[PDB]
């Protein structure tokens, strides 16, 4: 889309400097069997099906990202939260930035119960809504600085009848692959749930959750070759 340097999955994640106008097309070619991000914060992509997100997006003739945040992340259940940024995610005005599709609900510090959030269908009448979410996990001593828990955290999401589970990882992190290149201590896991027209999504989470802000609104069908 006349934008530079930024891969297809990179735009699919809402990485800063890759917000941009998305045109519609009735035919699309598929050129990445393994979509790769060269930018935003290091991700353990194979933990989930997140690699197939942009190739799923091109299957829709008309695709657009939500103009407003699906939810406001600061007042979510679990105490007031700051909105996260990072140096591995350079915002052209600030040495720090993050995905526009998600938010880092980092507490202002005690163990917490599993928290439940419904996700609205704020997209228009018929366009399928892909909701992108994830969770962060760092090593033991920084999980203590960040959260009130060094134990593995529990996560699970449910929408359209698809109910998944997750559990974070502490320590022994794989090297930093497909990111902004700056040495970090933690890692990121990203997943997405699709919401049919009218229906809601649910996410059960603990400390370390990445709450969603910008959700995809996709409609139409585009031929794929």
């Amino acid at each position, epitope marked *: 889309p006349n934008c530079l340097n930024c891969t297809d999955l990179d735009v699919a994640l809402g990485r800063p400097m890759c917000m941009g106008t998305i045109p519609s097309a009735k035919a699309s070619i598929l050129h990445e069997v393994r979509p790769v991000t060269s930018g935003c914060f290091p991700i353990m992509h194979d933990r989930t099906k997140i690699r197939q997100l942009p190739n799923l997006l091109r299957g829709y003739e008309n695709i657009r990202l939500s103009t407003h945040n699906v939810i406001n992340a600061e007042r979510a259940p679990g105490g007031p939260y*700051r*909105l*996260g*940024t*990072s*140096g*591995s995610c350079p915002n052209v005005t*600030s*040495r*720090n930035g993050f995905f526009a599709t998600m938010a*880092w609900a*980092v507490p*202002r510090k005690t163990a917490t119960n599993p928290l439940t959030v419904e996700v609205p269908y704020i997209c228009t009448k018929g366009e399928d809504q892909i909701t992108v979410w994830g969770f962060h996990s760092d090593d033991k001593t*920084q999980m203590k*600085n*960040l959260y009130g828990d060094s134990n593995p955290q529990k996560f699970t999401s449910s929408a359209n009848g698809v109910t998944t589970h997750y559990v974070s990882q502490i320590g022994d992190f794989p090297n930093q692959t497909e990111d902004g290149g*700056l040495p*970090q201590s933690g890692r990121i896991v990203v997943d997405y749930m699709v919401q049919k027209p009218g229906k809601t999504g649910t996410i059960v989470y603990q400390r370390g959750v990445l709450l969603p802000q910008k959700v995809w609104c996709a409609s139409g069908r585009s031929k794929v070759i």
Partner: antibody, heavy 126, light 108 residues
């Protein structure tokens, strides 16, 4: 906005001491905090910088391994635990607020230091 | 590490003169520089941040310019209460470096 440094005085070389920076007038847990010393006659020297959490700690080489920065967002106090003191740690230690409420959480949370205190005098001598 | 070669070392000028202070960097910081003024025996007040923008309350005769490795601080019309030791400071790298300082005094 106020920043008050306290706890500086006369100490032996090699012993321990701790300064306290009592903040008031702004949301202390949103900003990153700094430490800058100025030995009398010379200029400003950066000591350490802690972010709005206690998760990230940066130290200048001369103090790395000997000093320790920390903060209490409830009692809005910035701390600096200096250990194995040297006579060239003798300086006027300033407490500084970073203007930007940057929740960087990785790097670059330090910016223009808008607000400074009046400092506390530390003289390491036997 | 980035060394702040601030210049001059000490100057003097009559009231109304144009005062200029340059700060070089050994490596590119590109905006992350800012200027402080030393009220004698008193705190540092921030005048210029991000090397060109002007802080709340500080007068119009103070200006900063520069990018990359060269930065310029200028007082358009020197006043008597400007007697101070001014300091530049880069915050582009995790270690922070302050310039050597420049002593400003009035020629009367």
């Amino acid at each position: 906005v106020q920043l008050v440094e306290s706890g500086g005085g006369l100490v032996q070389p090699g012993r321990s001491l701790r300064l306290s920076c009592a903040a008031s007038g702004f949301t202390f847990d949103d900003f990153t905090m700094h430490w800058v010393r100025q030995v009398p006659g010379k200029g400003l020297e950066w000591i350490s910088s802690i972010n709005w959490k206690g998760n990230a700690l940066d130290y200048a080489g001369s103090v790395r391994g000997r000093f320790a920065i920390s903060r209490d967002n409830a009692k809005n106090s910035l701390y600096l635990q200096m250990n194995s003191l040297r006579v060239e740690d003798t300086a006027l230690y300033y407490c500084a607020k970073d203007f930007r409420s940057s929740s960087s959480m990785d790097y670059f949370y330090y910016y223009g230091m808008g607000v400074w205190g009046q400092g506390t005098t530390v003289i390491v001598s036997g | 590490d980035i060394q702040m070669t601030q210049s001059p070392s000490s100057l003097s000028a009559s009231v109304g003169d144009r005062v200029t202070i340059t700060c070089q960097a050994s490596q590119d910081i590109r905006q992350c520089l800012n200027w402080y003024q030393q009220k004698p025996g008193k705190p540092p007040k921030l005048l210029i941040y991000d090397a060109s923008t002007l802080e709340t309350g500080v007068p119009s005769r103070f200006s900063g310019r520069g990018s990359g490795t060269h930065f310029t601080f200028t007082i358009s019309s020197l006043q008597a209460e400007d007697v101070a030791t001014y300091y530049c400071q880069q915050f582009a790298n995790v270690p922070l470096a302050f310039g050597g300082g420049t002593k400003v005094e009035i020629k009367r």
